[PDB]
């Protein structure tokens, strides 16, 4: 019977926080900020205010146009039926151009809407990167969050823009839909011979699994050391308390080595961005310098060989 | 029209314009390359 | 109307108009490029 | 407002307009050369 | 093997790009490992750990980097690892004796480990000046001096369903053995994270009604029966919880003193907690 | 550090085990070669 | 050798078993009784894996300890026909369980909560789902995945395609979402801490007020320093838990193509429209 | 050689040796069970 | 060569030697078991 | 141009250049290997 | 060129040079092994 | 050249060298075992 | 921070190691060229 | 030991060079034995 530090029991509500004052060139923040009891159980209860700047507003405008174009094409695909839109919600999409158009501009209803939606969505994420970059600089912080986001954009641009351009056709890019973009993910692996054999896909999984592993470790460690005020990590970095000592000692005694309170966030930071960086690189390599990842794996001696269990099929057209 | 720079930071406007010019120039040059007529490196005939 | 600037902030309104028109100008030019009759680079018969 | 006086704002505005005009002047000559190479306004029958 | 991407009869671009990342990843792991060694290094190799019978400093692989300088907002520069935190750790004389003379043997505390600071009761050397917020206010402060704070995130929840939005002021504090140590008389809040950090309580059940003591919120089980249960320590052991130097302020050093004491009860509160199941 | 005597004491302890370990290893390899030599000729084993 | 602040923490007690007999450190590692058990299980499993490598191939990627055939059912197989995989599986389960029990002793010795062993138990639960629970429900140990770096990737591929489109698995969709969300949360949390404590050169180290302000400026909400670690553990553990759910329902509780599972959505009377 | 015990704690070497002997005995017995000739319970013929 | 133990700690070298030789001794024995001519348990013709 | 070295740390610039030179030299060498004409180890005939 | 050691830390450079040259030497030997004309182990005709 | 043992800790250099020597020897022996000409326990003819 | 005398001593042992390494590398390349020249002719090797 | 004197550094180096030479000499003897078994430098035609 002990407090498990899962939900906050006792809460205190002060005045709503306007935030750290910005330089006298940024737009005023919004004036709407409230407190939610439900969100205070997990963490900070205050919702709002939000900053709306030049890049923030422009990113929303590009993002809305992208979402409207995708949504209207989805709704038109089911003959404007809201009932069929709900029924087919996971299946509808905005389809990329067919392969015949290459990298040229296709007609609106033959991949043109996809290219416009992709362009405006790319602009919105690029402007959102600048928005995240400027907010960190305005408060005098480092731009680590912005560059972590830029790593995510790299995979977003590699999958949807850079790799299709290298392949010479917009058709290879991914449709704007839920199940259709899962179909693209599977068809990508089928087309290029089991993307499991892509080494950068393996590495991207290493850091994806390692990110969940690291946050499970770090999240549990901080919650386990929450008795000693471990969640106050800034103070524990500039002034090492016993929580940082116990957290470091917990993992040292467990697996022989440990990080610091600051350095575990570097580990988590790099694991998250390496997942997305290696993923983007692996997508760029396939189709461009590797045709069949399994045959590439056989060429490098990594494909296992299985003993006979059945009578092998022989290609009748071979 | 000189009162703009009283209202707006001259530096932040310049980055805004440069980013707009860089993005627009790249997009226009890319669109021309996609065409079968203005693709100068492809050397297509009219 | 000159009184519009006592309700709306002129500094913010000018920025909103410029980024707003940038999105609209890009969208319309792209739509015309994605049509047969008005793609001036493709030069299809009208 | 920003930390610029009238003279600073007017000094920036003159250079901004000169830089814009020179940038536009180069861009116009670039488009004149481009039009001489291949016009981008097709006729009713196309190119 | 022919086609685009081929570099030799066997090497191809996707293979060399992979080895380029292996080199980058190895360098990154070295960098990350060096960042791991900015606290606690070089290692103190005590006399019993070496055949030369003299204390030594061990760097390890990779060796610790150059010291890091943090610029603080108040106008100070602190070099990490801090000199005084290391100096304190290597100069104090522990009130504990190793169970066996060889290296790796656990320490057996001689006196009261909860007040001496051994094991789970240990505290770090921290600054004795109470922290301040960015605005300049006192960071951790009780509700009496921080009147802008009210207990309960939602008034309606705290009013009509007070079980899930409790106000623990006036509750009773129970030790790990059910001893009624005292009664909560105040809540200390962090102006930076907007959270209750401690529950101030009198010691009326085991001492005087005017003696104030801080109970960390993470060591307190605030029940639905107007009770706060402290599984960490015995009700009588509340009398030895470290006291505040100033009645209205708490320093980072004091925070470690208090959380260290309650953490000492994980092993030392009652006999048998330090013993195995079988 | 350690003295000459302690260093010599350790090396005497090390020399005992090294001789026995190398002696068994040498005898083991002589038996192993007598069983099946592991250096193939031009035609193999 | 020890960290310069480690001495005052290396105390006696907190063990679950073994007590004073195994309560000591070897270098930085705490041993305990479960450390001896986890070392015995780890070496035994690894050496058995290396022996299985010797009988097939020493190529690091091509080493494969495959489970027995489904024809053996739940029976223990001969050593070279899946029995070695079964022995290594119980060694790995023993190694993993003793590892978490060792962390519980270390948690108690340091006065920390048992969050880390419990979070690791979710990973153990996912592994036990793959090699025990799902094989048990389907009735044969041969449904487990082979112990090989590249061979178990082929197992994942074929098992995923046994349902013709594993992306349409609803529990798999949820588990992937948690996996993607936790690395997004990790990048945000890792970056935010680094941004505050390593600001633009010259500026001082920022406070917790800057952290809340930054994320409220970007997306309008900030979860706080305590909320993010609860959220990170929540997302990671749900990723672990729903991974076990997605694989446990694949074959014991769903034998058809996963896209066909969504036919219930397509036949909801509200939006049938036909 | 008796001076080895002035360097290593008797208990820690006993745990180390017993763990090694336990692991080694299991591996060899298991390796023999893998081979048909020395699988005594398997009962293969020579 | 007793001067070696003034440089390298004898106690940690012995443990390093035993663990390292354990891995090597197992590794070489396993290498022979992989071969045809030196797997004494299989007993293939030489 | 010597004033550049007061703006930037000479060590930092040299490491940046040397890393740039190393990566670029590796890229060009491997670019030549990818080509049929300039692969020296492949021994192609022009 | 001994002023290179006031800008560069000699102790750090020597360790980095050895590791960097280890990487380069292993790479080039392995490049020759992946070729057919310079794999000395395989011994293909030249 | 003897100054190397003043700049560096001799213990860390010896471990660094022996780590390289052990790893390199393992790599080379394994590479030979992977070939057919130099795989001695494989016993392949020339 | 680091004086001129140490820089001379660092460069002296650096030059000595550089000369020995470069000397062996040159001989190794001459031997490698004597074995199989790596620069193809017009028709190949 | 970290701050070795010049005399101790010089004596460490002398043993270091002798140990390195003995290690190299054993390796060279090993390579002559290995070369006798199967030469590793093929001719123009190969092995
Ligand atoms: C091409 C494919 C990839 C395309 C990617 C495109 C998108 C790029 C996004 C990815 C970048 C993520 C990292 C960004 C980051 O670290 O931000 C910190 C930093 C924050 O800056 P700040 O807030 O102004 O600084 C505050 C203070 O300086 C205080 O700041 P601080 O102290 O926190 O920062 C110090 C930090 C400084 O960090 C950095 O400068 C970032 C490192 C730059 C390179 C990024 C590497 C990842 C790119 C791909 C890697 C794989 C390439 C392999 C190619 C083939 C495969 O220290 C480090 O250097 C950490 C990195 C250590 C790397 C060790 C590598 C050794 C190599 C050995 C090789 C041996 C052979 O961001 C930058 O410095 C931006 C520089 C440019 C970033 C890349 C663009
Ligand atoms: C890309 C993906 C694929 C690649 C992934 C990466 C590769 C696979 C994963 C491997 C990663 C971890 C590998 C190493 C594990 C940690 C071992 C260790 O201690 O390392 C310390 C080492 C740094 O050591 P240090 O703290 O600087 O030590 C300073 C002195 O050595 C201080 O000296 P000292 O006083 O500590 O000396 C201790 C000495 C003294 O020994 C004695 O005297 C024994 C006396 C007996 C009587 O020896 C010992 O006591 C330790 C021997 C082992 C004891 C085992 C006892 C078993 C009990 C139960 C534990 C079960 C586990 O850190 C590492 O090498 C590991 C971190 C790097 C990898 C991180 C993971 C990256 C993943 C990326 C993905
Ligand atoms: C049959 C399917 C194939 C397969 C086919 C592919 C393909 C194709 C890809 C992957 C990719 C990945 N695969 Mg895979 N993959 C397989 C099996 C697996 C298994 C498993 C256990 O079986 C796992 C764990 C993984 C995991 C992974 C990741 C390591 C990697 C995705 C990283 C990521 O976070 O992207 C998610 C994050 C992003 C895409 C970036 C997001 C950032 C942007 C900016 C978000 C913008 C949001 C936007 C503004 C929101 C509004 C938009 C509008 C509303 C529309 N794959 C099998 C072999 N896989 C990707 C990769 O990197 O390949 C190496 C990839 O392209
Ligand atoms: C009697 C009390 C103790 C005991 C007391 C002592 C004492 C005292 C000493 C030894 C020493 C040794 N003992 Mg003992 N020893 C005992 C009984 C044994 C038995 C037995 C079955 O009875 C064996 C086989 C051994 C074996 C050994 C050797 C490890 C060592 C002697 C060789 C040496 O000098 O290494 C020297 C070689 C090295 C140091 C090289 C280190 C190898 C590194 C780790 C690199 C290897 C890499 C490896 C190949 C990687 C594997 C590949 C992977 C895929 C990566 N001892 C009993 C249990 N023993 C001596 C010793 O350890 O000195 C150092 C020593 O002084
Ligand atoms: C045809 C292939 C199918 C597919 C078929 C499958 C199959 C089959 C499975 C998954 C599983 C998963 N898939 Mg899928 N999946 C596909 C495509 C994807 C894509 C993508 C981008 O397309 C993604 C992101 C995913 C993601 C996922 C995850 C939800 C899940 C893997 C995580 C997990 O299991 O945690 C669980 C983590 C563990 C089990 C790790 C256990 C940890 C243990 C306890 C500790 C080990 C310690 C170790 C031995 C120590 C080593 C020694 C030291 C290092 C020294 N899949 C495609 C469409 N997928 C798996 C799953 O959910 O099952 C649980 C699974 O079985
Ligand atoms: C007994 C004495 C020691 C020893 C003592 C020394 C001393 C003293 C020196 C060397 C140096 C070298 N030694 Mg040594 N060295 C030994 C025996 C060897 C053996 C061998 C088979 O026995 C080999 C192959 C080497 C190899 C090498 C090379 C790494 C280097 C050769 C000259 C040089 O500067 O490279 C020329 C090439 C370069 C300088 C650049 C190479 C680029 C590579 C690809 C990456 C390097 C990154 C670079 C260092 C980045 C610097 C950034 C800043 C540090 C931040 N040594 C023994 C073990 N050696 C010298 C050295 O390393 O100086 C730097 C040197 O001063
Ligand atoms: C390290 C790689 C991982 C990663 C990192 C990462 N992602 C990031 C970041 C980082 C570091 C950010 O800083 C950024 C962010 O904002 O995070 C909170 C972001 C982000 N990652 C996001 C998504 C995302 N990340 C993903 C993945 C990942 N992110 C990786 C796993 C994925 C996946 C798995 O596919 C997704 C979907 C966004 C939430 C955010 C970037 C936001 C953005 O680009 O915004 C602009 C885009 C638009 C489409 C505009 C939307 C506009 C709205 C629709 C307006 C709504 C109308 C109206 C204005 C509302 C009010 C209504 C009125 C009626 C009042
Ligand atoms: C559930 C949420 C995520 C999570 C959490 C998590 N993992 C954890 C923890 C936590 C909280 C720990 O505390 C614990 C730890 O100490 O981490 C450093 C750990 C850990 N997670 C690890 C790995 C790991 N986690 C993974 C996943 C995840 N871990 C989830 C995504 C994966 C995946 C997805 O593949 C791996 C590989 C270890 C680094 C560590 C636990 C190590 C351990 O128990 O080691 C014991 C000693 C050994 C040497 C193991 C020997 C085992 C056998 C005897 C032999 C091998 C058998 C095995 C079946 C071989 C399989 C090979 C093939 C699959 C290639
Ligand atoms: C009717 O609906 C209303 C209007 C009511 C609102 C509803 C909206 C709805 C329901 C929207 C639903 C949206 C959904 C479900 C979207 C799903 C999106 C998914 C899952 C996307 C997943 C992957 C997509 C990717 C990765 C796309 C990548 C595309 C890229 C990167 C495109 C880049 C294109 C560029 C850069 C274009 C350049 C143009 C140039 C000029 C270069 O071309 C010449
Ligand atoms: Fe954190
Ligand atoms: Mg589709």
Short mmCIF file of C-alpha atoms and ligand atoms in Angstrom, two decimals, chain A residues 218 233 265, chain G residues 189 229, ligand 10:
data_model
loop_
_atom_site.label_atom_id
_atom_site.label_comp_id
_atom_site.label_asym_id
_atom_site.label_seq_id
_atom_site.Cartn_x
_atom_site.Cartn_y
_atom_site.Cartn_z
CA UNK A 218 12.89 6.76 -17.97
CA UNK A 233 14.50 17.44 -13.80
CA UNK A 265 17.17 12.97 -22.32
CA UNK G 189 10.38 15.43 -23.86
CA UNK G 229 6.69 10.95 -17.38
FE1 LIG O 10 12.60 13.38 -18.00
#
